[PDB]
Amino acid sequence: KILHRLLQD
Amino acid sequence: HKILHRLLQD
Amino acid sequence: LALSLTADQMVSALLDAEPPILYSEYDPTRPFSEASMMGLLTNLADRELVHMINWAKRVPGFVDLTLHDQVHLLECAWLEILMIGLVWRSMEHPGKLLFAPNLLLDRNQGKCVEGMVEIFDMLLATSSRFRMMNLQGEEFVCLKSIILLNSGVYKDHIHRVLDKITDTLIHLMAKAGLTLQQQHQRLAQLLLILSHIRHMSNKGMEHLYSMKCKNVVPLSDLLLEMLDAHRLHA
Amino acid sequence: SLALSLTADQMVSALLDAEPPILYSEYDPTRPFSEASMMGLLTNLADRELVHMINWAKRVPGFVDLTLHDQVHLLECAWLEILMIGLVWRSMEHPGKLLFAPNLLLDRNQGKCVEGMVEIFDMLLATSSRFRMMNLQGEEFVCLKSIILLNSGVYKDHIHRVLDKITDTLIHLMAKAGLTLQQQHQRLAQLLLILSHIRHMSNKGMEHLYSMKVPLSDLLLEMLDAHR
Ligand SMILES: O=S(=O)(Oc1ccc(Br)cc1)[C@@H]1C[C@@H]2O[C@H]1C(c1ccc(O)cc1)=C2c1ccc(O)cc1
Ligand SMILES: O=S(=O)(Oc1ccc(Br)cc1)[C@@H]1C[C@@H]2O[C@H]1C(c1ccc(O)cc1)=C2c1ccc(O)cc1
């Protein structure tokens, strides 16, 4: 999920 | 007309 | 006459305006099918609507509105008002929803109707939230009245009554021995739950007026008109 | 933690500095408008706004203290609410119109270009009008927006503690504004009741967005599918 990785970064 | 009208008038 | 009333008079008026807890259709057969489940709920909700309408007219300031405004508010809030009633009744029954004294359901029965279990969980969480907060009856009737007046307001009179109920809510918390900080916090906590109740209503509504849920059980004319008000649009 | 250690003034300061910028639309005042074009504009705008919202959320006190799964959940639930309250905030000083972007100021007449959006437009207008009459301050707005992020999917005790902290902050602001104790409770109530309307608009708007619907982006499609 894009939202997941953007929050990860 | 609507049933809600009648029940509110009473 | 609503603005002229005091805080205790406001509480007393709302407490005595409370609708009765209706019973479901007897002869049990734990609703395992979606047809029987929806049948019992539709029948129950339809009978509650009649009491809700007469309950609304006994809410200080509601009668003072035009008939058109009364209709709009009830159209917007009717499922919200049913839900906050349900979770209030379900407080002392953790893990279960008390639709009626002879109809106590858990989330397992929520699976009987395709897509209803998501909303049951939300209702159960709301009832659970109310429990840990030790929500009092005097606060509940205040919250339920707020839902009626606020959910369709979007009018200086309505907001004047809304402020009066706010004054009433704080008055209750002040009497309970809560400090000023505990008063704004608890008031904030209670009102934020109303947003969740709105959310549950909207998710529940879009299922209810869906063509699939309209065909499972013959809905009453009144309940169908209350749905039609929200079916504009999707 | 740190969100629980912050004072009310430190809370406001942290929220004000975390504010996302006001993005521009790709609107050409020649051009049509139409259902496809307008929906194309708003989608492109919201898509770009999402990236800033995600990084804004990290700067909200207590949010990064949550798990990654819970952060995802809160944003999936609240993203349209946050977009909407931001929109009506931008439109306060523009009566009868919605300021999607500095180069995109629309009225309800043009909201009808998309079939079924005029009702939500009217609700957005009413909400913005409501903020104008209340003279909503920026310090209050950033608090409300943070409340929306934390509350719209809270259905856990840490979040509620941060919520109580933001509550104290709102009260602190109103007390410095000279409002009496009665006026503070009422204004606090009025603001939080508006969040119920914002929730309503989001739900109604959402079921339209993931309906037949013109090309949505990859991130925006996942935010929508979270509600479907
Ligand atoms: O939001 S729901 O759970 O409705 C549905 C949601 C999804 C599906 Br799929 C089907 C129904 C709703 C809350 C509760 O259970 C559903 C429902 C209901 C069902 C049928 C009706 O004609 C009217 C009300 C409920 C309900 C009924 C009476 C109450 O006093 C309180 C709640
Ligand atoms: O709730 S709506 O009005 O959405 C629609 C509702 C009905 C129809 Br029909 C179409 C869209 C929504 C509010 C405002 O305009 C719609 C919309 C939007 C449109 C497309 C997207 O992909 C994302 C957001 C809005 C919006 C966009 C950016 C903001 O910063 C704030 C609001």
Side-chain angles (χ1 to χ4, degrees), chain A residues 1-4 6-9, chain B residues 3-9, chain C residues 2-4 6-26 28-31 33-67 69-110 112-153 157-159 161-174 176-211 213-230 234, chain D residues 3-30 32 34 36-111 113-114 116-155 157-160 162-215 217-227:
Chain A
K1 243 187 287 185
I2 295 90
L3 174 61
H4 191 274
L6 292 186
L7 283 171
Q8 219 172 35
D9 186 19
Chain B
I3 306 181
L4 186 50
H5 294 307
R6 177 173 63 79
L7 307 180
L8 279 166
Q9 288 190 13
Chain C
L3 312 179
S4 306
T6 70
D8 288 336
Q9 291 175 0
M10 179 65 57
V11 170
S12 299
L14 293 182
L15 283 179
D16 287 322
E18 272 300 277
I21 302 183
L22 309 183
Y23 280 79
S24 176
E25 297 164 308
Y26 55 86
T29 333
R30 308 173 85 263
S33 63
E34 75 166 6
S36 63
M37 179 70 71
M38 287 294 299
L40 297 177
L41 299 188
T42 293
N43 178 276
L44 172 62
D46 180 75
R47 285 180 286 123
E48 284 186 281
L49 285 181
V50 181
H51 292 273
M52 181 195 302
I53 290 165
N54 295 278
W55 159 84
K57 292 187 295 184
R58 292 189 181 94
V59 165
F62 187 80
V63 3
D64 297 323
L65 297 171
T66 62
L67 184 61
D69 290 329
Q70 294 184 7
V71 168
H72 180 66
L73 291 189
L74 279 173
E75 282 176 344
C76 293
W78 69 268
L79 189 51
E80 287 191 85
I81 296 172
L82 286 182
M83 285 178 172
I84 192 185
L86 174 60
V87 301
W88 164 252
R89 298 193 300 269
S90 309
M91 285 226 308
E92 44 217 355
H93 300 271
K96 298 184 185 300
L97 292 172
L98 192 127
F99 290 85
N102 60 337
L103 196 56
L104 187 59
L105 309 181
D106 48 45
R107 85 174 300 272
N108 290 328
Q109 289 156 113
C112 298
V113 179
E114 176 65 27
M116 192 177 61
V117 72
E118 319 290 322
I119 302 164
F120 268 25
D121 292 334
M122 298 192 299
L123 289 167
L124 285 173
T126 312
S127 179
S128 177
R129 181 85 184 97
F130 274 166
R131 195 185 310 107
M132 298 302 302
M133 288 193 61
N134 284 273
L135 179 67
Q136 301 296 298
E138 293 87 338
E139 296 177 321
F140 158 74
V141 296
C142 275
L143 288 176
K144 190 168 61 172
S145 301
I146 287 174
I147 291 182
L148 172 60
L149 296 170
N150 181 46
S151 292
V153 73
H157 164 64
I158 300 180
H159 291 123
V161 183
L162 286 176
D163 292 329
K164 188 57 193 58
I165 306 184
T166 300
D167 298 336
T168 306
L169 270 176
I170 293 296
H171 172 66
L172 299 172
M173 304 173 186
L178 293 170
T179 62
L180 274 177
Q181 187 183 16
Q182 289 175 327
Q183 286 176 24
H184 322 146
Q185 287 185 6
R186 180 171 179 86
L187 173 69
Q189 288 159 2
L190 287 178
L191 299 179
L192 288 181
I193 298 174
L194 299 192
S195 174
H196 288 112
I197 294 183
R198 175 89 64 146
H199 183 74
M200 295 186 296
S201 178
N202 292 331
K203 309 309 293 179
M205 195 72 70
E206 81 173 304
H207 280 111
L208 285 175
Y209 60 60
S210 69
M211 215 53 56
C213 288
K214 281 192 176 183
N215 300 333
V216 54
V217 167
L219 306 180
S220 63
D221 298 327
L222 172 60
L223 191 58
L224 190 59
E225 289 183 352
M226 302 297 287
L227 287 173
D228 206 319
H230 283 265
Chain D
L4 308 183
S5 178
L6 293 177
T7 79
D9 293 329
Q10 294 174 350
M11 177 65 63
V12 174
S13 172
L15 292 186
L16 288 181
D17 294 322
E19 272 302 284
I22 299 182
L23 304 188
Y24 273 83
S25 173
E26 298 181 350
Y27 171 71
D28 187 22
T30 75
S34 61
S37 64
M38 186 172 303
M39 282 297 302
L41 295 177
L42 301 185
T43 298
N44 176 267
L45 180 65
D47 173 72
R48 281 150 46 219
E49 283 186 279
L50 281 182
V51 184
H52 285 96
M53 182 191 302
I54 290 171
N55 293 273
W56 157 87
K58 303 181 189 180
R59 303 192 57 179
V60 176
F63 187 80
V64 296
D65 295 339
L66 302 176
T67 57
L68 198 37
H69 171 90
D70 290 337
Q71 291 179 13
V72 165
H73 178 72
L74 290 184
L75 277 172
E76 280 173 332
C77 292
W79 68 269
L80 188 51
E81 283 187 84
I82 298 175
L83 285 183
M84 280 179 175
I85 193 184
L87 174 60
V88 301
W89 166 252
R90 297 197 294 274
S91 308
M92 275 186 58
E93 56 276 71
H94 302 264
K97 298 199 184 309
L98 295 173
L99 190 67
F100 292 91
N103 55 9
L104 191 56
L105 185 64
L106 307 177
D107 48 32
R108 76 178 304 271
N109 289 16
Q110 302 155 36
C113 288
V114 181
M117 196 175 62
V118 61
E119 291 297 327
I120 294 156
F121 259 52
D122 290 331
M123 290 189 292
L124 289 165
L125 288 177
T127 309
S128 179
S129 173
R130 180 60 181 178
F131 280 172
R132 176 165 56 257
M133 291 186 299
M134 296 185 62
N135 195 22
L136 183 66
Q137 297 302 294
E139 291 77 10
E140 299 174 323
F141 160 73
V142 291
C143 278
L144 290 180
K145 193 162 61 172
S146 296
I147 286 179
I148 288 180
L149 174 61
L150 293 172
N151 181 73
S152 292
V154 74
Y155 60 85
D157 184 79
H158 166 67
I159 307 176
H160 283 99
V162 182
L163 285 173
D164 287 340
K165 207 67 198 309
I166 303 179
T167 294
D168 305 333
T169 306
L170 281 170
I171 289 301
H172 176 62
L173 295 169
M174 303 176 187
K176 284 205 304 179
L179 278 70
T180 68
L181 269 170
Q182 186 188 54
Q183 289 173 328
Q184 295 168 35
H185 306 158
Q186 295 181 7
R187 183 172 181 89
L188 173 62
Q190 293 167 6
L191 288 178
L192 301 188
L193 288 182
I194 294 168
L195 303 187
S196 176
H197 299 155
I198 296 178
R199 180 82 64 120
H200 182 73
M201 294 186 289
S202 178
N203 293 135
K204 300 305 294 179
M206 198 80 64
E207 62 179 309
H208 273 290
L209 284 176
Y210 57 67
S211 62
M212 85 210 72
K213 309 156 185 294
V214 301
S217 63
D218 296 335
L219 174 60
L220 198 43
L221 209 58
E222 290 189 347
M223 308 297 291
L224 285 177
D225 277 37
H227 289 255

